[PDB]
Write a protein that binds this ligand. Structure first.
Ligand code: 0EY
Length: 124
């Protein structure tokens, strides 16, 4: 079965590209990472840094999670990311997304042993 750590990697890691996300990027990535299988996942962020750099965030700046839990961490450095946001005319199964590249500090929730990212909370 898929671990929470693996699920974070599938939903949120894309080290392979630096940013260059075409306007098509989210349409393709949301589908291929299986985030459009059951419904159109409304919002999702992919991070284009190494897995080591993203895992490292779990030992960086401790901040409150949006849900009030205390296990979130904000990257000290900005990171290359792409936000995917479902369009207003998007209708499942043909899920459609606006693709927006940015360089921002990521906030992730970490859990487990080893202590690794399991949710993407926000970018700031
Ligand atoms: O700027 C953002 C803000 C929220 N999110 C949501 C998210 C959370 N997660 C975490 O892992 C998923 C495991 O099912 C959950 O939806 C959430 O805990 N995945 N996507 C962004 O991707 N970018």
């Amino acid at each position: 079965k898929e671990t929470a750590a693996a699920k974070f990697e599938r939903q949120h890691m894309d080290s392979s590209t630096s940013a260059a996300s075409s306007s098509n990027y989210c349409n393709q990535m949301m589908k291929s990472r299986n985030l459009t299988k059951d419904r159109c996942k409304p919002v999702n962020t992919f991070v284009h840094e190494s897995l080591a750099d993203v895992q490292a965030v779990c030992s960086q700046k401790n901040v409150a999670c949006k849900n009030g839990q205390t296990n979130c961490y904000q990257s000290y450095s900005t990171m290359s990311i792409t936000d995917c946001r479902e369009t207003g005319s998007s209708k499942y199964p043909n899920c459609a997304y606006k693709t927006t590249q940015a360089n921002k500090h990521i906030i992730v929730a970490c859990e487990g042993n080893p202590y690794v990212p399991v949710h993407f909370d926000a970018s700031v």
